[PDB]
Design a protein around this ligand. Structure first.
Ligand SMILES: CCCO[C@@H]1O[C@H](CO)[C@@H](O[C@@H]2O[C@H](CO)[C@H](O)[C@H](OCc3c[nH]nn3)[C@H]2O)[C@H](O)[C@H]1NC(C)=O
Ligand SMILES: CCCO[C@@H]1O[C@H](CO)[C@@H](O[C@@H]2O[C@H](CO)[C@H](O)[C@H](OCc3c[nH]nn3)[C@H]2O)[C@H](O)[C@H]1NC(C)=O
Lengths: 133, 133
C-alpha cells in the first residue's frame, strides 16, 4: 500500500500528474481515483506479469463497493526499472489518461462525482511527484 | 480543509517539497506532518494576521491528541497572493524546515519519529505539487 491522498478537489478539466519509479522486478501497479476506496471512477492497473496477464493495462470502476466491467487497452508504454509519468483529466463523459510514449486513451466515467477527491497508489510504483495543475 | 496524504513513508534525511499558492487574502495557513492526525511532529503555521500574531510562524507538536508548547520563529518570508515552496527533512533530533528566500529553521523532533507518514494542509495555502527526494 502506497500513497493515499484525500480532499484533492480535482475539478473537470484539471490535470492530475503522477510521476513514479517502476520497480525493476515490477509485476503490476495501481492508481485508484475517485471519492473513496469504495467509489472509484478509475482503477488504473498496468499488469507487467499479474493475474495471468502480461504487459496489459487493465482499467475498471468501483461503485458502492462493486467492481464494474473491466476494460483492457492495447498499448503498454511502461518498462520495469524506469521512471513513468501518468496524467489524468476528466469530464462528465470520460476520464482521459495520458501516458508515456505519446499514448492516450479514454475510460468511461461511470460515477457521478462532481470532483475527484481521492487517489491511492499501490504496487510496484514508487511515487516521486504529484502535481495538481 | 486542504489536501490530506497518508502512507508518505518519508524517512530520515529524505526531502519533502511542497509547493503551493498563498491566497491573496491570506491570514494563516497550516502544514501538519506526523504519524497521523493526532500525532504531529510538525504543526507549521505561518500567521499573517491570526490568533493574535502578525507575520509570525508558529510551530507546535501534537502527541496523542495533546498540543505541545508553541515555538515562534524569527523569520517570515511569505507574502499573500504568491507561490511558495517549503522543504522539510528530519532526523533523530530535529525537523529542518527550508523556506523561501534562503531562510531555514529547526524544530525539535519531540515525538522521536523515525518516519513521517501523514501530511495535511489547511488554511490559505493551495497545494499544487508534492515531491519526494
Ligand atoms: C474469467 C475470469 C477472469 O476474471 C478475472 O477476475 C479477477 C478477479 O476479479 C480480476 O482481477 C481483479 O481485477 C480487478 C479490476 O477489474 C482489480 O485489478 C483486482 O485487484 C484489485 C486490487 C487488489 N489489490 N490491489 N488492487 C483484480 O484482482 C481479473 O482482472 C479478471 N480477468 C479478466 C481477464 O477479466
Ligand atoms: C490569541 C492568544 C490567546 O492564546 C492563543 O490560543 C490559541 C488557541 O489555543 C492558539 O491558537 C491555536 O494554536 C495551535 C497550535 O499551538 C493551532 O495553530 C490552532 O489552530 C488549529 C488549526 C485550525 N486549523 N488548522 N489548524 C490555533 O487555534 C494561539 O497560538 C494562542 N496565541 C498566543 C499569542 O499565545
Amino acid at each position: 500500500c502506497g500513497l493515499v491522498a484525500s480532499n484533492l478537489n480535482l475539478k473537470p478539466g484539471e490535470c492530475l500528474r503522477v510521476r513514479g519509479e517502476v520497480a525493476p522486478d515490477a509485476k503490476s501497479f495501481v492508481l485508484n481515483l475517485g471519492k473513496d476506496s469504495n467509489n472509484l471512477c478509475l482503477h488504473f492497473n498496468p499488469r507487467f506479469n499479474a493475474h495471468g496477464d502480461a504487459n496489459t493495462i487493465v482499467c475498471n470502476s468501483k461503485d458502492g463497493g462493486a467492481w464494474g466491467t473491466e476494460q483492457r487497452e492495447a498499448v503498454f508504454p511502461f518498462q520495469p526499472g524506469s521512471v513513468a509519468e501518468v496524467c489524468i483529466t476528466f469530464d462528465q463523459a470520460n476520464l482521459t489518461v495520458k501516458l508515456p510514449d505519446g499514448y492516450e486513451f479514454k475510460f468511461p466515467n461511470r460515477l457521478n462525482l462532481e470532483a475527484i477527491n481521492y487517489m491511492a497508489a499501490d504496487g510496484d510504483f514508487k511515487i516521486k511527484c504529484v502535481a495538481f495543475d
